[PDB]
């Protein structure tokens, strides 16, 4: 019948793998273009290059997420296999015409070329273009993968294929070339340390406004460099994390380094009055982070203030001004009830901002851990694509804030200072944080023991210059 007529117009399974009929054993849809819930990799590749219609949502989501279920080398082999569509044999009447040296009618052959082969081949090249355009890092990390792509693209022949080959070749060239303000920004603020005097640069010697600005610029650049694929499949926690998630790992290491540096600054200031000044100055840095909508920065300070060594320092926070304590308390409350107030704040403000990154890693980990890699139907494993789409939706939220530059002048020496923070030294984190906690017990012992006094370490004025910028 008509079903067998349609299916037999496609190539048979012995000469081509991407034309088997749809069924429950190889593909599932979600409850318009159908939304793919699960399927075998061969069915996902078929639908990624589907003859009947374009599917940009699926193409975008696939090329973001595919590394969780398919290697780059393997993907290129599959789409090249997909591309190589065999043509049907001539009809009996046309076989006779070819036998006599005459031109065959080739009515069905021409229809198959028109309505199946050319569309699929164009879809394969659309995937190739999207691949090199938005995920060129695959080809940077694997030179052999690029050699295969350029050999494939370079041997494509046809009238309708010429324009696609040239645009793909043009994009590949631009990505190699790249590989090798709006308004007036405010005046760079200084306090004790002079411009160029990098030896004197420290928490209390630099201006707190300028610390916040330069950290916001640093954290903005780190935020914007993270690609969606660096988060997919929890690859930042696997053994190839350094190659797969370099920008994410850099952001995490900065957060760890800054947060522990704040803790180190506080608890290695053994004098009570000086430690109050240190804590007060870090709160001022938080207030300027808040002014700049650097929520990453705000919650880095909250993390440092809530840590085991700092949070217990009752005598230090006793002397902190009530207004600063209120600001600290409101910063904390951003995280309560699964970050409800933070998300409300994030939605309400105007750009530019730097979102809190940690929340994306939490929700991705829960999505990765909470959903199965495969769905089973009749003893066959199908790749759980809905899982990948949900992860891709979270990385989509990251990307909407990744084009918000700050109107703030970079200061190279202050940037270097914060880029090169190494509070742990040779120690590992766990042992260093144990050291931090043991320091807290020394400077402020538990209730049975009294509070000893400690000498001053700072030889310069401790009074803050404040958080309001120079506008007299
Ligand atoms: C449930 O346990 C906590 C409650 C908190 N509730 C507020 C309102 N704020 C916090 N943290 C802020 C950032 C904080 C940190 C350090 C000191 C202070 C503070 C405020 N006043 N006095 C001390 C406040 C909190 C930290 C908690 O566990 C570490």
Curated annotation (Swiss-Prot):
Tissue specificity field: Expressed in gingival tissues.
Domain of life: Eukaryota
Protein name: Son of sevenless homolog 1
Domain (N-terminal Ras-GEF): residue spans on this chain: 32-176
Disease note: Fibromatosis, gingival, 1: A form of hereditary gingival fibromatosis, a rare condition characterized by a slow, progressive overgrowth of the gingiva. The excess gingival tissue can cover part of or the entire crown, and can result in diastemas, teeth displacement, or retention of primary or impacted teeth. GINGF1 is usually transmitted as an autosomal dominant trait, although sporadic cases are common.
Role this protein plays: Promotes the exchange of Ras-bound GDP by GTP. Probably by promoting Ras activation, regulates phosphorylation of MAP kinase MAPK3/ERK1 in response to EGF. Catalytic component of a trimeric complex that participates in transduction of signals from Ras to Rac by promoting the Rac-specific guanine nucleotide exchange factor (GEF) activity.
UniProt domain Ras-GEF: residue ranges: 207-446
Organism: Homo sapiens
Lineage of the species this protein comes from: Eukaryota, Metazoa, Chordata, Craniata, Vertebrata
Subunit description: Interacts (via C-terminus) with GRB2 (via SH3 domain). Forms a complex with phosphorylated MUC1 and GRB2 (via its SH3 domains). Interacts with phosphorylated LAT2. Interacts with NCK1 and NCK2. Part of a complex consisting of ABI1, EPS8 and SOS1.
């Amino acid at each position: 019948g008509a079903m067998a007529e349609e299916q037999m117009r496609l190539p048979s399974a012995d000469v081509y793998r991407f034309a088997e009929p749809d069924s429950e054993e190889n593909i599932i849809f979600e409850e318009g273009i159908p939304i793919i819930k699960a399927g075998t990799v061969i069915k996902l590749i078929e639908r990624l290059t589907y003859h009947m219609y374009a599917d940009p949502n699926f193409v975008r989501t696939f090329l973001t997420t595919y590394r969780s279920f398919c290697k780059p080398q393997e993907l290129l082999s599959l789409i090249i296999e997909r591309f190589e569509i065999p043509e049907p044999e001539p009809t009996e009447a046309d076989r006779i015409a070819i036998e006599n040296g005459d031109q065959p009618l080739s009515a069905e052959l021409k229809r198959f070329r028109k309505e199946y082969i050319q569309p699929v081949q164009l879809r394969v090249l659309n995937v190739c273009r999207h691949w090199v355009e938005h995920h060129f890092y695959d080809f940077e990390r694997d030179a052999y993968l690029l050699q295969r792509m350029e050999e494939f693209i370079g041997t494509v022949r046809g009238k309708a294929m010429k324009k696609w080959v040239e645009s793909i070749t043009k994009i590949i060239q631009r990505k190699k070339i790249a590989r090798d303000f709006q308004s007036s920004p405010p005046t760079v603020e200084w306090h004790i340390s002079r411009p160029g005097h990098i030896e004197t640069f420290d928490l209390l010697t630099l201006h707190p406004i300028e610390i916040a600005r330069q950290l916001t610029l640093l954290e903005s650049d780190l935020y914007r460099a993270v690609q969606p694929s660096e988060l997919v499949g929890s690859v930042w926690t696997k053994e190839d994390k350094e190659i797969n998630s370099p920008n994410l790992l850099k952001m995490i290491r900065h957060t760890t380094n800054l947060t522990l540096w704040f803790e180190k600054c506080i608890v290695e200031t053994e004098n009570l009055e000086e430690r109050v000044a240190v804590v007060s100055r870090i709160i001022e840095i938080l207030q300027v982070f808040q002014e700049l909508n650097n929520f990453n920065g705000v919650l880095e300070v909250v993390s440092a203030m809530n840590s085991s060594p700092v949070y217990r320092l009752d005598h230090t926070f006793e002397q902190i001004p009530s207004r600063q304590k209120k600001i600290l308390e409101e910063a904390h409350e951003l995280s309560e009830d699964h970050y409800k107030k933070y998300l409300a704040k994030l939605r309400s403000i105007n750009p530019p901002c730097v979102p809190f990154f940690g929340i994306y890693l939490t929700n991705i980990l829960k999505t990765e851990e909470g959903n199965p890699e495969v769905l089973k139907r009749h003893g066959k494993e199908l790749i759980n694509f809905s899982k990948r789409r949900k992860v891709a939706e979270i990385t989509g939220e990251i990307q909407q804030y990744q084009n918000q530059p700050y109107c703030l002048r970079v200061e190279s020496d202050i940037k270097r200072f914060f880029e090169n923070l190494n509070p742990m030294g040779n120690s590992m984190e766990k042992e260093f944080t144990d050291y931090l906690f043991n320091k807290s017990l020394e400077i402020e012992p538990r209730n049975p023991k009294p509070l000893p006094r400690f000498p001053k370490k700072y030889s310069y004025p401790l009074k803050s210059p404040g958080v309001r910028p120079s506008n007299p």
